[PDB]
Design a protein around this ligand. Sequence first.
Ligand SMILES: O=C1C[C@@](O)(C(=O)O)C[C@@H](O)[C@@H]1O
Ligand SMILES: O=C1C[C@@](O)(C(=O)O)C[C@@H](O)[C@@H]1O
Ligand SMILES: O=C1C[C@@](O)(C(=O)O)C[C@@H](O)[C@@H]1O
Ligand SMILES: O=C1C[C@@](O)(C(=O)O)C[C@@H](O)[C@@H]1O
Ligand SMILES: O=C1C[C@@](O)(C(=O)O)C[C@@H](O)[C@@H]1O
Ligand SMILES: O=C1C[C@@](O)(C(=O)O)C[C@@H](O)[C@@H]1O
Ligand SMILES: O=C1C[C@@](O)(C(=O)O)C[C@@H](O)[C@@H]1O
Ligand SMILES: O=C1C[C@@](O)(C(=O)O)C[C@@H](O)[C@@H]1O
Ligand SMILES: O=C1C[C@@](O)(C(=O)O)C[C@@H](O)[C@@H]1O
Ligand SMILES: O=C1C[C@@](O)(C(=O)O)C[C@@H](O)[C@@H]1O
Ligand SMILES: O=C1C[C@@](O)(C(=O)O)C[C@@H](O)[C@@H]1O
Lengths: 158, 158, 158, 158, 158, 158, 158, 158, 158, 158, 158, 158
Amino acid sequence: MKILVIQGPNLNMLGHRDPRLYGMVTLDQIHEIMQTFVKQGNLDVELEFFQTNFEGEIIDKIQESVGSDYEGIIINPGAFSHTSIAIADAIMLAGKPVIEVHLTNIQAREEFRKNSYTGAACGGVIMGFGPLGYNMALMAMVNILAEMKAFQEAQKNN
Amino acid sequence: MKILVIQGPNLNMLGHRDPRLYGMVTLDQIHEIMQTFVKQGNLDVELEFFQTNFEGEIIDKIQESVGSDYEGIIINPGAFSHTSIAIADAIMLAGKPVIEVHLTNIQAREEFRKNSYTGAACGGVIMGFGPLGYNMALMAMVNILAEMKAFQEAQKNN
Amino acid sequence: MKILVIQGPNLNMLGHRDPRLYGMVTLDQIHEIMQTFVKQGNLDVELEFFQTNFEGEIIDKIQESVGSDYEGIIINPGAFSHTSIAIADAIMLAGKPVIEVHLTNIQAREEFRKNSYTGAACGGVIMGFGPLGYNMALMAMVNILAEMKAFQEAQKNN
Amino acid sequence: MKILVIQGPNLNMLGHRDPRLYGMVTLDQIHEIMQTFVKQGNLDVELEFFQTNFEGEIIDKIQESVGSDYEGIIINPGAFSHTSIAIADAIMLAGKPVIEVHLTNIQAREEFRKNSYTGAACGGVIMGFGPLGYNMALMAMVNILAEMKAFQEAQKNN
Amino acid sequence: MKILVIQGPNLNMLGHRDPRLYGMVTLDQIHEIMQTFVKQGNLDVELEFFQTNFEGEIIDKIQESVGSDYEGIIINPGAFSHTSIAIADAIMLAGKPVIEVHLTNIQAREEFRKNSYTGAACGGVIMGFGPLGYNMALMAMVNILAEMKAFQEAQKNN
Amino acid sequence: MKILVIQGPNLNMLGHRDPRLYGMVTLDQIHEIMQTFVKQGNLDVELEFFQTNFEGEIIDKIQESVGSDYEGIIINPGAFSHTSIAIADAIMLAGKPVIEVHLTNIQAREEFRKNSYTGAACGGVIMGFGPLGYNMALMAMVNILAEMKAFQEAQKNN
Amino acid sequence: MKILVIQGPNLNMLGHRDPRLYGMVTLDQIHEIMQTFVKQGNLDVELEFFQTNFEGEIIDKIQESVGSDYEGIIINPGAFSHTSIAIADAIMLAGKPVIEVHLTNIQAREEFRKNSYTGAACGGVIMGFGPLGYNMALMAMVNILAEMKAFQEAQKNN
Amino acid sequence: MKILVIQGPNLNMLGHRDPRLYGMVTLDQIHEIMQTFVKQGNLDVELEFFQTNFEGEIIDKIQESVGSDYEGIIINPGAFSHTSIAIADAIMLAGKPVIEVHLTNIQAREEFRKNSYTGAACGGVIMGFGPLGYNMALMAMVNILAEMKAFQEAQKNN
Amino acid sequence: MKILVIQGPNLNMLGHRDPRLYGMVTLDQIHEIMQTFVKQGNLDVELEFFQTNFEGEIIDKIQESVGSDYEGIIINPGAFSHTSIAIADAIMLAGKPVIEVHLTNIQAREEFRKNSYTGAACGGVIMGFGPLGYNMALMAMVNILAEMKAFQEAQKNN
Amino acid sequence: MKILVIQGPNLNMLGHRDPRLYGMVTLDQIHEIMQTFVKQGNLDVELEFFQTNFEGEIIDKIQESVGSDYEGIIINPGAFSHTSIAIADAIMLAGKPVIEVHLTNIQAREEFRKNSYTGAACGGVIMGFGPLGYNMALMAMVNILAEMKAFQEAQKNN
Amino acid sequence: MKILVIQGPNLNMLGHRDPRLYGMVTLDQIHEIMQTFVKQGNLDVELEFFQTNFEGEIIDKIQESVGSDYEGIIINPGAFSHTSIAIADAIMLAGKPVIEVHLTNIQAREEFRKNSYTGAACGGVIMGFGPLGYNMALMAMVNILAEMKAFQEAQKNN
Amino acid sequence: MKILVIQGPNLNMLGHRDPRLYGMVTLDQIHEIMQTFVKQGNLDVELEFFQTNFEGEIIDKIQESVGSDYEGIIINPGAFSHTSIAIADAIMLAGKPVIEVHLTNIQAREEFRKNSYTGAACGGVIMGFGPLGYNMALMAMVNILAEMKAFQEAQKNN
Ligand SMILES: O=C1C[C@@](O)(C(=O)O)C[C@@H](O)[C@@H]1O
Ligand SMILES: O=C1C[C@@](O)(C(=O)O)C[C@@H](O)[C@@H]1O
Ligand SMILES: O=C1C[C@@](O)(C(=O)O)C[C@@H](O)[C@@H]1O
Ligand SMILES: O=C1C[C@@](O)(C(=O)O)C[C@@H](O)[C@@H]1O
Ligand SMILES: O=C1C[C@@](O)(C(=O)O)C[C@@H](O)[C@@H]1O
Ligand SMILES: O=C1C[C@@](O)(C(=O)O)C[C@@H](O)[C@@H]1O
Ligand SMILES: O=C1C[C@@](O)(C(=O)O)C[C@@H](O)[C@@H]1O
Ligand SMILES: O=C1C[C@@](O)(C(=O)O)C[C@@H](O)[C@@H]1O
Ligand SMILES: O=C1C[C@@](O)(C(=O)O)C[C@@H](O)[C@@H]1O
Ligand SMILES: O=C1C[C@@](O)(C(=O)O)C[C@@H](O)[C@@H]1O
Ligand SMILES: O=C1C[C@@](O)(C(=O)O)C[C@@H](O)[C@@H]1O
């Protein structure tokens, strides 16, 4: 049950960014808490991490998810979420649950961060809760896949 | 540890609303799942429910939260979140964590639902995950109050 | 066959308003003409009157209409029709015909009166014909309920 | 007492249009119901029908109404009502009551149908009530001309 | 000579608000300075205080002013002044002087506070001078009522 | 204690302007009432008058105020208040209280008079109360300088 | 030397229009003054008159001007000048001087009359001077054709 | 198999238009190349030509196409494609394939030529390729009607 | 009968400006043609010339016109006509005819030259006809003053 | 005679996309029909296929076309055509014909798909005709290169 | 080789301005560094300094530069660069190189400072580098005049 | 002292671009002049060159600059400067001086080139001076690093 975790642009440079917005945490410490989260709450979910500063690498990655190994995607397209209609399109072609995560609250920053093309493609969006946002996405995700296979087989024997 | 749960306008009429947006669930069944959630995961949080079609009752309610009995607020101001700068102001004067919850994804509907004055005042915002959104708010909330009293007393003996 | 008649804000102060827009008539004289209208043309429609300066009282009232006693609503949300997406939402959840009435022509006044969130939810909208507008709504309404029970039972014995 | 009835553009093609908007009725069946309406309720009003796909034919027609034979106009300028300031101007120069009628609710369609230049020139506007809209215009019209000759002669012997 | 003093939304929570905008003063200390103001400068003006977080309570209150006991209104509709066309309408129907007061300078804050529907209905508007703003309104008001009864009777004996 | 009084453009032509907006008063009669105001209420404030149709003369004048002779400025930049970011900048560089005064209510006129670049730089803004507006500015001003020297020396002996 | 004079829409109904805008003059009295103008000042210019409420008749007419009989066009496209890019295109294809005339000042009316697609195609535009506007166009026109044949032959013998 | 070819406004004046946009070709030479095109590639398509400067003649023409003689329409509504919602409506009521053709590239000219109301109604749009655009429309059209009768009868024997 | 002729900004530098817009003529040659115009057609009008690059000098000049020596103003506020609401205000306070003249056609240049605050204050506006524009203003002006003294005394003996 | 065929973003995932927009066809089946098209109609054009989800790979590819092997480009920049001014710039630097192709009609979808920066750089644009669009581009292209070498050598022996 | 250095509005008050934007430097210290710059790097450029708070004095000054004594202009129109189309026009009529300098980065401040009418007229624009900006302009300028006289005479002997 | 020089998109194709904008120079000749610049003026600055058509390669490159080898960046993000908030973010996370360079004047081209997200992140911006712009950036840069190490150590021994 692979859960793809895609981080947008400058998310790797967390730590050099404003300590007033992203505090003092690295894209790794947050990746490991998602671990200590699925590690703690025994959830047979093997999650993979992928981060790029390319709009293209993200789209490709999304596209490789149509395989099977992957059953869901937690993504923070970052700054590309307000401009990338291409990533938004990719998020629609994937036949899997995609949850958008934003460390900061995009409603409370520059006017050009209020809108999310990508987030409007995903099923749900989370923003504002710092690194804690991905764990929330993890909860939500496991609860969705669960409730989707319970509807899938529920309408198989009928 | 009272957690105030405030539901905006037509949220009580869930069930008569489009089954394509809000499915088939009532504002009560969702209130009880928040129960079976705090009931299950033993969390000493006694949560209260309050719902109004008045912008005024919401503001008042928010204001009564400056008491002490309340330590956090999970709110879905509903349609008022795009117009009410007054509720947004109230959300700023309260000295407590407020998490905004939206059943639907406001990025994917009419243009006049994209912006949230209220949500930009809160710490974080959740949207799209149906009734499951409040449980996510519950997780987030307990994890915030916890991490706030661990910072509060952490800087008391120093 | 109760027909709820809901008047928005300052509609009670008709008489103190500009005699150039609303002439010299009170919200009562207009309520009684709707009477002398259903009184004259024998139509078994008992209509109720309700007026508030609250967006909330209107929404509640709309909501109580899901009962049965009420079979239709003639409403003039007044100034709230250009701002209230909440009343507009309520007008959609009600499973009954709602006709919007405006004494004045909202196309011919301040730019902020041209749009009607509420009116776009209702089945039809009437504006410009002074107090005569509600009688037109009455005609229309009786003609709609009639043509709805003729379609209802028409597809019951088949 | 000639009442000119002017139908805008594609209104003749009713029947080929979306059955979801204009149902299944022709510009004739609706013209005859306005008949069976004035025919039934004995009202000495001889109404004439005129329909064009030309903005020009409409303006001319409006202009010929300054004669005397005509005492009122029920019009549905259709798609020209959002663009034609020329028809709107004509509606102002005519010294007679003009009532604008729209089968559909122009508040609930494409953004470019919300505004009516023409409708803002007329005394009142009706929209949403299907073919029933013109009968409402007929009621309104007879009630206006009546109340205008009662004011005309009322201030003649004084 | 009753002067109604109406305070909009979160104005009661002054003290919990930003000390950088509203400093450290309560809606009461400011109400008493308006007292020590009319108390000091002997002005036979008995002023009443009324504050609500409801757009509706404000409109009602305004409406009750058509009595006689009241001869003027000093109001700070607060956040509702940028959205409430209903309160603006009420301010026009009242046949008495209304002066709008804003503690802060609405020209120097968020873009959505620049416009005042309500303030454009009142005779004058004051903003920026902290609690001192209402005393200025008091001066202005007494100077207006005075200059209005001097014009009223001045054109009574002629 | 020199208080500079700066009048913008066509303010000298008061008297030739619309009697419906500025009534029948000259820029002098209003200057003398500010006199009979400080003359009456014994306030050791010697106020100077300066009026120009130049954006430049105003800026210069503002700049000469950094002297000492001047302790405050009451200004009506007039039509330049909606366009002059240069006068607005000057109003920020001056280290003294500036109060903006408008005879008319700029919220109730042409759309291009609603915004005030200059007024958003000043501490407060007054509009609508005819010539009485400057006396209000005078009150406010003396009350501010007073409350500023009471804070100045209050934090000198400590 | 035929000068085509094209009048747009409702220009024939001059006389029924607002006496506050177009006074009391008919499209004929103004046509004859253009006569008594070329009649008086001996100018061998035979001018033709053409008026329509059709955007199409105007374009055609413009197109027939590529003949030879016509050497210039004085036009008032009226309300079509703000919407007709087609008439504007026609005004560009004609290889002759076109002068746009407006009785009223289109800068001082509804926002939708400020722009002129057609006028921006013509060489010059005149507005505000009532019927006197066409005589001004006549002067201008004769002075242009004159100065064009003096440049035409001036660069023929060289 | 009649294919109606409708040319909008000033398309007949091709030749007098800018040689930089439309080169040196007449609406006839282009009509004959569509001939030498269907003449060469043996395609039993008899195409008719119709051109007007009237928005009305175009709509009528479109409407007459509901006959049978016509099986498709290649149209260049020209300048009316950016303003005519009426022609756009007509293009929707016709139950036949309509292909929009533009000699020039409307994306590369004045801002008011970028949008096509009419083109958004048609199945496809072609622009930029000079007269060659209609031959492309011809190819496309024959390929569509062919693929439509192969789907029509393909689901007739089943 | 002094006619003030006011030239805005860079109008003195005519000759250094684009020969494609203003050709090859100086602000003097154009001033003398207005002379050879009133000189030729015997019109007892002594016209004065005034040109500045200051918005202030223009306003002052306008203001000095309330004298008597001046009976009309022909003005080209130039670039200030799109920004100067102050000059526009001055043009309203003057109790004399003001005609706005523009060498070029402001409808056919940069978007920021389309609107004229000043021109909307004047009685009429002329643009596009090169230096010939002022002579047209001269005709118009003499024809207006003439028709104003014929109305003035016409209603003096009655 | 290499014709480069560049496909933008998610065009490879055709088949997983909405069957209502892109039907049931893969980026390959469409590539082979362009083959069976040049294969059938004997046209010595060897076309190459290139598809990326990168804005960068597209620009590079475009740039490599300045070689010689390539004589034209048929491109569908997809979602990047509305945002990529960089690809638009590349399309201008290439000294070869570029034809833009869109499977769907970008005039009939989300507002952010109406504009094409890239398409406005190309010579022509095709949209709406499903996979058939590229064959149309092929026709057009061969007809352009042909007509370009007939102009090239036509002005070589002269 | 006189280089005119023109400083816009409040640039003389540098020192009283925000130390966070303009630091602690006076318009003189910066004028002398431009000296110690041309003084150090032996460049036969005698530069003159001119500063005004008048839009008019700037335009005049620009105009006097058409003399000869001046061979270039380094200017910081300051706040007038976003509003003054008149100064922008003057910058176009001058037949000399003009370089615009901004101490601060106008892209990073209030929305009304992003655009520069004046800067778009100049050859180049520099912003952000504090007082160092003018020295950069000096380098650039000497390098331009040099490269202009090397092109001037380079095409004189040919 | 490595100075990273990053060139955006189509900057490598300089030479094929419009000779009217970028003249006749290649991205290399300009790179070598930056050499002959640091080569001439003995400045121990070893500058590196990097150019891509990828938004991603640029961000990466920026990110690698947090090393130490690099002490500054001169960048021309080209067309990405108006759209890339991601590159703008990267420019903020780097703890080094970044100077934005534009060959052309982005204030004087298409509306979509006026704004620079990236340039508003950098310390300063240079535009308009052709290849000479980078040498100006070089001067500025060396002068900044110098003045930064003089402030760095200046506050180390204290
Ligand atoms: O970099 C970021 C951070 C972000 O993705 C987030 O974590 O909330 C939100 C983005 O819009 C923003 O530009
Ligand atoms: O009613 C609703 C539902 C909502 O609150 C939600 O649950 O997501 C969102 C609101 O914007 C909307 O109007
Ligand atoms: O008050 C009114 C009256 C109104 O409801 C009407 O009766 O037409 C219309 C409202 O928009 C307006 O504000
Ligand atoms: O065609 C129609 C129908 C319409 O006139 C109506 O009947 O409501 C409304 C028009 O805006 C629209 O385009
Ligand atoms: O709360 C406030 C305070 C306010 O009323 C004032 O006191 O100035 C102004 C309002 O716009 C604002 O939202
Ligand atoms: O002239 C005036 C008068 C004014 O300054 C005032 O007195 O209120 C306001 C200005 O905006 C306006 O243009
Ligand atoms: O009808 C008219 C009159 C007009 O053409 C004129 O005469 O000035 C101007 C038009 O814009 C307007 O609609
Ligand atoms: O006239 C024309 C020509 C045109 O139809 C074309 O052929 O491309 C496009 C129209 O927008 C334009 O106004
Ligand atoms: O300079 C000019 C010339 C002008 O006044 C004219 O003569 O038409 C028009 C102005 O808008 C423009 O800026
Ligand atoms: O005052 C200033 C300073 C400025 O000219 C500058 O030095 O960068 C920029 C101007 O826009 C601004 O208003
Ligand atoms: O390509 C370019 C060139 C540019 O970077 C410059 O060199 O000035 C500016 C960019 O906006 C533009 O698209």
